[PDB]
Amino acid sequence: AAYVGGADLQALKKFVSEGNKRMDSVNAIVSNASCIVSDSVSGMVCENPSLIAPNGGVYTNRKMAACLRDAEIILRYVSYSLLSGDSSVLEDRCLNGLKETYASLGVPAAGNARTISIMKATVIGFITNNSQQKKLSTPAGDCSALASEVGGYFDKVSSAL
Amino acid sequence: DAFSKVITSADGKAAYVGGADLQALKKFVSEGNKRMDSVNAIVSNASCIVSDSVSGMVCENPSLIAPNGGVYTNRKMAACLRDAEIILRYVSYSLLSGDSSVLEDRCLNGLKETYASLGVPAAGNARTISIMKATVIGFITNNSQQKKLSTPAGDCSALASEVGGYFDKVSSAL
Amino acid sequence: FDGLAPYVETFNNRGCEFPKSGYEGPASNDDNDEMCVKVSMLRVKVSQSYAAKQIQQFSGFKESGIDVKQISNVKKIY
Amino acid sequence: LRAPIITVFDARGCREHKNREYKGPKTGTQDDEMCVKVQYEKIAACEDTAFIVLKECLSEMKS
Ligand SMILES: *CCC1=C(C)C(=O)N/C1=C\c1[nH]c(/C=C2\N=C(C[C@H]3NC(=O)C([C@H](*)C)=C3C)C(C)=C2CCC(=O)O)c(CCC(=O)O)c1C
Ligand SMILES: *CCC1=C(C)C(=O)N/C1=C\c1[nH]c(/C=C2\N=C(C[C@H]3NC(=O)C([C@H](*)C)=C3C)C(C)=C2CCC(=O)O)c(CCC(=O)O)c1C
Ligand SMILES: *[C@@H](C)C1=C(C)C(=O)N/C1=C\c1[nH]c(Cc2[nH]c(C[C@H]3NC(=O)C(C=C)=C3C)c(C)c2CCC(=O)O)c(CCC(=O)O)c1C
Ligand SMILES: *[C@@H](C)C1=C(C)C(=O)N/C1=C\c1[nH]c(Cc2[nH]c(C[C@H]3NC(=O)C(C=C)=C3C)c(C)c2CCC(=O)O)c(CCC(=O)O)c1C
Ligand SMILES: *[C@@H](C)[C@H]1/C(=C/C2=NC(=C\c3[nH]c(C[C@H]4NC(=O)C(C=C)=C4C)c(C)c3CCC(=O)O)/C(CCC(=O)O)=C2C)NC(=O)[C@@H]1C
Ligand SMILES: *[C@@H](C)[C@H]1/C(=C/C2=NC(=C\c3[nH]c(C[C@H]4NC(=O)C(C=C)=C4C)c(C)c3CCC(=O)O)/C(CCC(=O)O)=C2C)NC(=O)[C@@H]1C
Ligand SMILES: *[C@H](C)[C@H]1/C(=C/C2=NC(=C\c3[nH]c(C[C@H]4NC(=O)C(C=C)=C4C)c(C)c3CCC(=O)O)/C(CCC(=O)O)=C2C)NC(=O)[C@@H]1C
Ligand SMILES: *[C@H](C)[C@H]1/C(=C/c2[nH]c(/C=C3N=C(/C=C4\NC(=O)C(CC)=C4C)C(C)=C\3CCC(=O)O)c(CCC(=O)O)c2C)NC(=O)[C@@H]1C
Ligand SMILES: [Cl-]
């Protein structure tokens, strides 16, 4: 594990834009990961229930478990892109060749696309969240640049897949 | 009867109520269609209800995942998440049937003594239950951020009061 | 205590062209013929691997879901 | 199947945990009470999560 605190953290927040808000946006994603993942995958399914019909993309416990895992993997590489301000790791370690893996496994591209579009809207919603301050975990304010940025990272995923 | 047979079978056999039997069931319970929507709001959100309720217990008292805390180990956290779901599911059945008998007899009977013998913190259970109650009521009354279940718009305050009572039986018992 | 709990399932499936299995009673000749409640008793299980994910997810002690009361603390309260 | 697992610790005011993991220079500011942890581990496929999500799905199918 790497630990970035104290002066290293202060420095990190000078080398990336929007440093404090950026840490907050990452915290909101990782602290809500299980719902982000389940809402995205189950929204793909509820809109296209044939995905859980016999022979559908996620119709068994095992298949669904793998899909939930992959959705989490993608979310986590997006979270690291937002932490670091760069999509290099996401592109090289998670998206490079993933479309071909999914072709070989018969994972449906339209299903993936919808999981991603729900996930993108959800994560952006955690960043653009306009709840009244007493119902908000961070100081209220403008996180538009981070919302745009993370939308770009999801768009890289969608393009690759 | 049909549901008590599967509740006592305790072996995965299922009961199915559709068609005319379901039309009849909805005549024999109060607000039958709204009651099914209320149940739906629990069972289609089960995983996030459990997670948010335990997560709020923990953020209010982070020492619950400090060493020796009530849910510090994967084993203890798994048991706690499990119990929260068990309780939520007995509440869902209480709402389906309009009665808390099974919740009281099969879930709550002996539960306090069990937690006392295991050292499970009563204050942690109290917070988890309060959040689960609020979350369920939020989904039932369209007070939630997400409104994924399409219903006709109307007042479900009676059903929200009823399910709140079932959670209050849990809180009382614990 | 056996870990068993009632799983209630609410199938509101008007318009669904999927074979109907489960219900074996009379038809209503209305929309209830496309709706069903299922109940079964099953052991509730949570894996240690999911529990570990949850511990990590909760370890910020700060970020809630959207538009809810904030109750987090930095001191041990009990 | 590894991914970066990030934990963000805004620990301002938290005394029960001793801030011993980060070993670099301090600042004399509240940044000394905050830390980001990053670890690259295998992400598990959880069949209990799959089962509960499938149950959720079965009760909310659109048509
Ligand atoms: C789960 C985490 C979460 C918390 C906590 C919270 O307060 N909001 C959260 C999630 C969230 N979801 C969305 C958007 C969508 N979610 C779905 C899936 C569900 N809709 C269904 O019909 C369905 C099956 C019955 C679901 C499961 C969908 C489709 C969307 C919309 C995606 C889109 O194209 O716009 C958001 C975004 C904000 C919003 O309110 O839509 C958030 C924050
Ligand atoms: C299941 C996830 C979800 C979606 C998706 C959605 O749209 N709503 C959802 C959950 C939900 N939660 C509540 C209420 C509460 N949740 C908490 C816990 C969080 N607060 C924290 O401080 C914290 C740690 C940092 C949490 C995690 C709390 C405290 C509440 C309020 C409970 C109370 O006493 O009233 C709701 C209900 C919202 C409402 O009142 O309408 C819902 C729907
Ligand atoms: C429409 C929602 C749909 C499409 C389109 C599709 O591809 N699959 C769809 C639905 C679907 N339904 C199930 C399982 C299931 N449905 C019911 C309700 C149904 N059964 C009845 O007897 C009646 C009405 C009287 C209705 C309505 C039940 C009870 C079940 C569960 C059966 C069981 O195993 O206990 C599924 C799941 C896949 C499968 O193979 O069952 C889908 C995808
Ligand atoms: C206060 C929120 C709190 C109470 C009250 C309590 O009982 N336990 C509390 C906090 C807590 N913190 C952790 C784990 C943890 N905190 C940090 C941040 C910290 N470490 C540093 O070096 C610095 C420097 C800037 C800060 C700030 C880290 C990195 C960790 C992770 C430790 C690890 O295993 O990698 C925990 C979890 C249990 C534990 O004490 O380890 C709690 C409950
Ligand atoms: C969109 C991302 C959010 C939003 C975030 C804001 N955060 C603001 C200030 C702020 N946040 C922190 C904590 C952060 N810094 C860290 O180093 C770490 C942990 C390593 C975290 C979690 C700090 C320290 C600050 C500065 C104020 C303070 O001392 O507490 C902020 C104010 C504007 C700004 O600082 O630029 C905002 C708007 N706010 C929202 O409404 C959405 C949901
Ligand atoms: C609080 C509960 C909700 C709310 C619920 C309402 N539902 C209403 C009518 C309704 N709901 C269903 C689906 C329900 N019945 C079933 O049998 C099953 C599954 C087996 C389900 C999930 C039906 C079929 C109906 C009848 C109308 C229709 O044909 O769709 C309703 C209208 C009043 C009433 O019928 O009593 C309400 C108010 N409404 C809300 O605003 C909150 C969120
Ligand atoms: C979660 C919000 C709590 C928490 C829960 C824990 N429960 C633990 C063990 C446990 N729970 C039960 C009751 C459960 N079994 C059933 O069959 C039914 C109803 C049908 C229920 C509600 C039992 C019998 C047991 C002991 C046997 C077992 O471990 O499965 C548990 C482990 C405690 C320990 O080993 O130290 C925990 C952690 N713990 C918390 O801190 C929060 C408040
Ligand atoms: C979920 C939204 C979609 C879905 C997913 C699904 N995936 C698999 C199996 C695999 N997924 C991977 C993914 C990766 N390999 C990598 O290198 C990376 C980057 C780090 C990723 C994300 C791999 C290797 C596998 C095969 C190994 C395994 O099974 O774990 C499955 C299972 C397919 C099967 O039947 O075995 C599924 C279901 N499927 C969908 O329908 C959703 C759209
Ligand atoms: Cl049929």
Author numbering:
A (entry chain D): 16 to 176
B (entry chain B): 3 to 176
C (entry chain A): 3 to 80
D (entry chain C): 6 to 68
Give the text the authors published on this PDB structure:
We show that the cryptophyte Hemiselmis andersenii expresses an energetically complex antenna comprising three distinct spectrotypes of phycobiliprotein, each composed of two αβ protomers but with different quaternary structures arising from a diverse α subunit family. We propose that the macromolecular organization of the cryptophyte antenna consists of bulk open and open-braced forms that transfer excitations to photosystems via this bridging closed form phycobiliprotein.
The final components (~15%) are closed forms with a long wavelength spectral feature due to substitution of a single chromophore. The structure of the closed form HaPE645 provides an explanation for its unusual spectral properties. This pocket is specific for PCB and incompatible with a PEB chromophore due to the steric clash that would be created by Leu6. The excitation-emission map for HaPE645 suggests that this protein acts as an energy adaptor with excitation transfer from higher energy (562 nm) to lower energy (650 nm) chromophores within the protein.
